[PDB]
């Protein structure tokens, strides 16, 4: 069970899809979207 | 931006010496697939 | 751990590369005073005697 949940929706480049991992760096992970570095949940991501 | 690179098996050495290095050129660029290190995080070494 | 210097850890690394270097120093250095106190407890018990 979970005791609140946010699930978190956005599009990026393929190869920026490595910058969702948490504690990551890079023009996304700097100023665009960002997890902290004790993060605990799912990167889910699909080619759209 | 050397025009012609050597071959894996003769492999090119630069000594790179009294000079200031930033980094923060190459990673900023979105050219490379991999950028990857092992005894430093590239974020740091402009700090160095 | 890259280093037996702390700071040259935390000027080297992020910090999430960086904990991994730091927990072997604290392991490392945490097992070094629990045997020096150990050590000392029981030279102690030599000068109590």
Do not use: H, M
């Not at chain 2, 009294?18 to 402009?46: E, H, I, M, Q, R």
């Amino acid at each position: 069970c979970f005791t609140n949940v946010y699930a978190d929706s956005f599009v990026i480049r393929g190869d920026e899809v490595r910058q969702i991992a948490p504690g990551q760096t890079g023009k996304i992970a700097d100023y665009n979207y960002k997890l902290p570095d004790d993060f605990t949940g799912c990167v889910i991501a699909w080619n759209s | 931006n050397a025009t012609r690179f050597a071959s894996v098996y003769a492999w090119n050495r630069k000594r790179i010496s009294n000079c200031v290095a930033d980094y923060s050129v190459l990673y900023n660029s979105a050219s490379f697939s991999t950028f990857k290190c092992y005894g430093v995080s590239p974020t740091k070494l402009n700090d160095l | 751990a890259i280093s037996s210097v702390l700071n040259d850890i935390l000027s080297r690394l992020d910090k999430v590369e960086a904990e991994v270097q730091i927990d072997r120093l604290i392991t490392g250095r945490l097992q070094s005073l629990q045997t020096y106190v150990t050590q000392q407890l029981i030279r102690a018990a030599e000068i109590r005697a």
